[PDB]
Write a protein that binds this DNA or RNA. Structure first.
Ligand SMILES: [Mg+2]
Ligand SMILES: [Mg+2]
Ligand SMILES: [Mg+2]
Ligand SMILES: [Mg+2]
Ligand SMILES: [Mg+2]
Ligand SMILES: [Mg+2]
Ligand SMILES: [Mg+2]
Ligand SMILES: [Mg+2]
Ligand SMILES: [Mg+2]
Ligand SMILES: [Mg+2]
Ligand SMILES: [Mg+2]
Ligand SMILES: [Mg+2]
Ligand SMILES: [Mg+2]
Ligand SMILES: [Mg+2]
Ligand SMILES: [Mg+2]
Ligand SMILES: [Mg+2]
Ligand SMILES: [Mg+2]
Ligand SMILES: [Mg+2]
Ligand SMILES: [Mg+2]
Ligand SMILES: [Mg+2]
Ligand SMILES: [Mg+2]
Ligand SMILES: [Mg+2]
Ligand SMILES: [Mg+2]
Ligand SMILES: [Mg+2]
Ligand SMILES: [Mg+2]
Ligand SMILES: [Mg+2]
Ligand SMILES: [Mg+2]
Ligand SMILES: [Mg+2]
Ligand SMILES: [Mg+2]
Ligand SMILES: [Mg+2]
Ligand SMILES: [Mg+2]
Ligand SMILES: [Mg+2]
Ligand SMILES: [Mg+2]
Ligand SMILES: [Mg+2]
Ligand SMILES: [Mg+2]
Ligand SMILES: [Mg+2]
Ligand SMILES: [Mg+2]
Ligand SMILES: [Mg+2]
Ligand SMILES: [Mg+2]
Ligand SMILES: [Mg+2]
Ligand SMILES: [Mg+2]
Ligand SMILES: [Mg+2]
Ligand SMILES: [Mg+2]
Ligand SMILES: [Mg+2]
Ligand SMILES: [Mg+2]
Ligand SMILES: [Mg+2]
Ligand SMILES: [Mg+2]
Ligand SMILES: [Mg+2]
Ligand SMILES: [Mg+2]
Lengths: 134, 60, 178, 143, 259
RNA sequence: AGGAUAGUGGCCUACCAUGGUUUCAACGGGUAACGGGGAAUAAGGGUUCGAUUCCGGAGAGGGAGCCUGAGAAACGGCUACCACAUCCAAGGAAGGCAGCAGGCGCGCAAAUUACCCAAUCCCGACACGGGGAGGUAGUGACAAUAAAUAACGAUACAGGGUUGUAAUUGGAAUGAGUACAAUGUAAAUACCUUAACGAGGAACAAUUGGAGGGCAAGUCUGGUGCCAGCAGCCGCGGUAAUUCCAGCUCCAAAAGCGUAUAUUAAAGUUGUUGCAGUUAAAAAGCUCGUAGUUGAACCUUGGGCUUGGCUGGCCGGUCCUGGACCCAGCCGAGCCUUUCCUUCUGGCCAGGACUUUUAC
């Protein structure tokens, strides 16, 4: 009915990245699926780890529902997790803030605009201003 | 060839054909259902006239 | 760029479009197995036509030839496995004697009606397409799904289907709730 | 001894003799001479656009008697002038002078069909709209 | 072509890496190094495709930049470093030592070895000649240059490298009956003893090899790597299968019983 | 002999010979010619294609010449000319999408001036930056896979041994679509999952070509009347047109179906396999004759002895399976027959000396 069931297979202990990594099978009959946040809480209970050291991603539900397969990571510490994680997953879990930058067009146009200046911007803009006598 | 001729008669027959509308008849089944309809019509209730089989018998 | 992805055709059309001594045979065969169109019949003939081509080549080699023994037995084992070939006909000469009705027998649509789960063969196809039938613990909605011998015994209604212990469907919920 | 050489070392004679004699296949000459490329009005293409020059009408061959209603078209790609049949009952009225028509062959692969003399093309589209669509009132001529 | 190539298309990579077609447009181009491009295994393939320790190319670079990976007793941080035959890979964090030996199927096996065996290596002698100031030296298959070798050592012999000092412990003379693994051709990975060396002045010498099952195959002298002083006495531990090639019918039968 | 080159070399110079290729097709011309891996069709043999996901090559509007560097005769480097072409205050200055997207032109003919380095990899002083390479989405009926457009009952008739339909009557089932949401992702979209919504004319309505023959399916009704038109070919229209224009009905394939062109099989109509040449097309008027092609027979056969392996069985020794003995059959050896089989040292393996040339 609910009965979220978790099975782990292909478990690999990875002290190179200070983590344990495995495949996650979720059996959730009479339930659309299980959210990553809910999967992360349950994993903390099963393996007695901090919730902030657990990462899941790449989930897909099988045909007919009731079962999903994914990938999971458990780090030896939250500090180790923060060191060996992609930025987008930490933003997913709330452990980091999404970096704000302009679009690729703006960065590229700005990069090519600065390319027409040799030396400091202060020299370039004061001297360019000098030319415009107005 | 010696080629010419009046062009005034283009579309003569089609223009003067009296327009007759199609009666708003029931739709035919599509896909698997239509093959089912034909199979019975040709192998279950055969309408043969002593070996004499017509798909489109004119009302004769 | 990226590597190309392989694809191939799964059927072949007749050389002569109009021939009653085949059009009637095809339709009689489509009506028996509740097929949607003639292409599902062309597909069976195509895969049987290249199995025959494969069988002829192995049969021209001498007996005890390494290729004939390995690939001939392997192809036979798969055919016995899907229930098309009987256990007493593993000789590669009865393979040449196979006919298209042997393959349509092993379709999911054919087996569901013949297992008594449906009133007619056309009821079998619509049951499959409407996500009611599961083989093992996996819902299969492909009518042409070829049933293996070990999967034969595990054909039943889906666990969440109205006919197999699941909840009531959309229409019934609309009437009894008023 | 069957006339052609049979010796095991006479492959050059066999290869050259066949090479000389395939020129007798008229289909083969047109492929290598590039006659479609050089002589065909379409230049080897399946279709070609042009401008309608005049509405004229062609007398059918014996024993038939009728007026096949065609147009004179000047092709855009090479400036050649050809005669193109306008199929169906009354489609000549869809084609006007100085209209843009898309052409295709008659299907006999460079020869005239039926009683129409010297005409090897048919009108497919006019003003970018299919003549069949105009005939069956699926679409209207853009004007 | 105006200069050296720096890319490797995915389809043009060596087949023994067993890379999939649709994972991307490019493949890892191995760096210049001790082993030839076609006969190497980049470190990125080993940690992600073989051990499946890393999930992607970003992760293999994070592993190696923390100084974990050692090849032949030195830490290497080059992700496309061309590790090759007889190379030792050490991961002291996982406490694992590997040696790159071909299995009989033609691929680089994941062959774990003990720390005791990981303390040395074998190298096939390509040439013996005199260096500057008249100092003789030996070039092994991995580009090592070892000076002052035993004067009995000649080409096609195999030397035992201390792998910590770079010296020669002892050697095996090339002769009939020596244990051999094949490092090229379609018989790559097979293990046997030399049966007959067929000489061809100005051409390629051919070596006749007897399988442990008395199956005979021929391969070029450039594909012969001496690994033992006699039959059944290899100087390093062999991978699973012991380099004996089975026919497909035997393999099908062998797979059938192991199940 | 020199010079030059990173180096060989007429690569170039000086001097000197008169050589070099070619009917076994040189040289020249054509190519709607970049080569290959490969593609279409295919009984076999073949025929046709390959600009294009990989490798090699060539070019960056056309030439030519260079700087830097390990590497370029580089072109998102430079110099000059030619052709285009931009700004100008008329003094001058600056260009190169056969990169991505986009525009014009050309045409029968081909998509967004979008997002991102998360994946794949590459570059750098680099664990950090960059990457229209690459990945994501958009357009997309190029092709390819699977696969809906309905299923089951009751009446009423007909009917055949127990149920197949022809009509008017029910309640079930489901996704196309919609959508909370979760998943997916760099972020999204979509897929996959999934609450609620979402099917009786279930208007949630399949089309495209045909119905004389080839070729499956009308001598039905109306219209026209050698006109209009159809018709790949043979043929169809002058008053009941089986072929036109329509309506009805039917046939074929179906999310596909038709047309044009090219190409393959059919084509044993290119024929080596495998054509034909008296009269249908086709033996030079007749001899000689070089090249080419093609060329009678003949030189160790038979016999004897020993042995290795595997098929049928008799043995059966049966857990479909395994032994000496025995028979036939099949494959290889090793000697002897006047005996080819190179010849020598350490003593069949390793170290010297010889060998008619091929084709197969
Ligand atoms: Mg600057
Ligand atoms: Mg019929
Ligand atoms: Mg042709
Ligand atoms: Mg040409
Ligand atoms: Mg005629
Ligand atoms: Mg047009
Ligand atoms: Mg090394
Ligand atoms: Mg010289
Ligand atoms: Mg030189
Ligand atoms: Mg010269
Ligand atoms: Mg040219
Ligand atoms: Mg060209
Ligand atoms: Mg190509
Ligand atoms: Mg080509
Ligand atoms: Mg090419
Ligand atoms: Mg071109
Ligand atoms: Mg290329
Ligand atoms: Mg270039
Ligand atoms: Mg250009
Ligand atoms: Mg240039
Ligand atoms: Mg450019
Ligand atoms: Mg460039
Ligand atoms: Mg420059
Ligand atoms: Mg562009
Ligand atoms: Mg197009
Ligand atoms: Mg556009
Ligand atoms: Mg990236
Ligand atoms: Mg791309
Ligand atoms: Mg995608
Ligand atoms: Mg299509
Ligand atoms: Mg529909
Ligand atoms: Mg929707
Ligand atoms: Mg939606
Ligand atoms: Mg949900
Ligand atoms: Mg129709
Ligand atoms: Mg007929
Ligand atoms: Mg009438
Ligand atoms: Mg009338
Ligand atoms: Mg009439
Ligand atoms: Mg009739
Ligand atoms: Mg007809
Ligand atoms: Mg009609
Ligand atoms: Mg059909
Ligand atoms: Mg053929
Ligand atoms: Mg004949
Ligand atoms: Mg003939
Ligand atoms: Mg005559
Ligand atoms: Mg002669
Ligand atoms: Mg002779």
């Amino acid at each position: 009915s609910d009965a979220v069931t978790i099975r782990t297979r292909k478990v690999i202990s990875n002290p190179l990245l200070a983590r344990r990594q495995f495949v996650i099978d979720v059996l959730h009959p009479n339930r659309a699926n299980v959210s990553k946040d809910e999967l992360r809480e349950k994993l903390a209970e099963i393996y007695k780890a901090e919730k902030d050291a657990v990462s899941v991603f790449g989930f897909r539900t099988q045909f007919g529902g009731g079962k999903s397969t994914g990938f999971g990571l458990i780090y030896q510490s939250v500090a180790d997790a923060k060191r060996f994680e992609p930025a987008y997953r930490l933003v997913r879990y709330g452990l980091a803030e999404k970096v704000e930058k302009a679009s690729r067009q703006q960065r590229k146009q700005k990069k090519n605009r600065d390319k027409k200046i040799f030396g400091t911007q202060r020299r370039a803009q004061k001297r360019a201003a000098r030319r415009n006598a107005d | 060839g010696k080629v010419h001729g009046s062009l005034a008669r283009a579309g003569k027959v089609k223009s003067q054909t009296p327009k007759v509308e199609k009666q708003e008849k029931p739709k035919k089944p599509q896909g698997r259902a239509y093959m089912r309809l034909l199979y019975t019509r040709r192998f279950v209730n055969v309408t043969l006239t002593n070996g004499k089989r017509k798909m489109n018998p004119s009302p004769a | 760029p990226r590597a190309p992805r392989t694809y191939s055709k799964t059927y072949s059309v007749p050389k002569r479009p109009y021939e009653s001594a085949r059009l009637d045979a095809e339709l009689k065969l489509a009506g028996e197995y509740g097929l949607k169109n003639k292409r599902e019949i062309y597909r069976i003939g195509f895969q049987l036509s290249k199995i025959r081509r494969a069988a002829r080549d192995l049969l021209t080699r001498d007996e005890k030839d390494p290729k004939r023994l390995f690939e001939g037995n392997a192809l036979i084992r798969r055919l016995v496995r899907i229930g098309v070939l009987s256990e007493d006909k593993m000789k590669l000469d009865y393979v040449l004697a196979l006919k298209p009705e042997d393959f349509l027998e092993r379709r999911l649509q054919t087996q569901v009606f013949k297992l008594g789960l449906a009133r007619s063969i056309h009821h079998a196809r619509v049951l499959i397409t409407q996500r009611h039938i599961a083989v093992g613990k996996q819902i299969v909605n492909i009518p042409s799904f070829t049933v293996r011998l070990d999967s034969q015994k595990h054909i039943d209604f889906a666990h969440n289907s109205p006919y197999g212990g699941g909840r009531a469907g959309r229409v019934k919920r609309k009437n009894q709730g008023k | 001894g069957k006339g052609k050489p049979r010796g095991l070392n006479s492959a050059r004679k066999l290869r050259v003799h066949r090479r000389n004699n395939r020129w007798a296949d008229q289909a083969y000459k047109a492929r290598l001479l590039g006659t479609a490329f050089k002589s065909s009005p379409f230049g080897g293409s399946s279709h070609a656009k042009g401008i309608v020059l005049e509405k004229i009408g062609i007398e059918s061959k014996q024993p038939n008697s009728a007026i096949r209603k065609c147009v004179r078209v000047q092709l855009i790609k090479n400036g050649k002038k050809v005669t193109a049949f306008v199929p169906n009952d009354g489609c000549l009225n869809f084609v006007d002078e100085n209209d843009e028509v898309l052409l295709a062959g008659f299907g006999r692969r460079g020869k005239a069909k039926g009683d129409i003399p010297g005409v090897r093309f048919k009108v497919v589209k006019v003003s970018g709209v299919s003549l069949l669509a105009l005939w069956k009132e699926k679409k209207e001529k853009p004007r | 072509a105006r200069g050296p190539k720096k890319h490797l298309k995915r389809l043009a990579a060596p087949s023994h890496w067993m890379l999939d077609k649709l994972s991307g447009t490019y493949a890892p181009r191995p760096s210049a190094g001790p082993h030839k491009l076609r006969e190497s295994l980049p470190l990125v393939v080993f940690l992600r495709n073989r051990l499946k320790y890393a999930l992607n190319g970003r992760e293999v670079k994070a592993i190696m930049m923390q100084q974990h990976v050692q090849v032949d007793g030195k830490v290497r941080t080059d992700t496309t470093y061309p590790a090759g035959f007889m190379d030792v890979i050490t991961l002291e964090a996982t406490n694992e030592h590997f040696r790159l030996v071909y299995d009989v199927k033609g691929k680089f096996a994941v062959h774990r070895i003990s720390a005791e065996e990981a303390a040395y290596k074998l190298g096939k002698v390509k040439k013996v000649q005199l260096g500057k100031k008249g100092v003789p030296y030996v070039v092994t298959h991995d580009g090592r240059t070892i000076r002052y070798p035993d004067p009995l050592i000649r080409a096609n012999d195999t030397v035992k490298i201390d792998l910590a000092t770079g010296k020669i412990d002892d050697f095996i003379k090339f002769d009939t009956g020596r244990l051999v693994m094949v490092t090229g051709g379609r018989n790559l990975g097979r293990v046997g003893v030399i049966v007959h060396r067929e000489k061809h002045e100005g051409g390629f010498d051919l070596v006749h090899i007897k399988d442990a099952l008395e199956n005979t195959f021929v391969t070029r002298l450039s594909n012969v790597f001496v690994i033992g002083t006699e039959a059944g006495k290899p100087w390093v531990s062999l991978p699973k299968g012991k380099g004996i090639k089975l026919s497909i019918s035997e393999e099908r039968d062998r797979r059938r019983a192991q199940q």
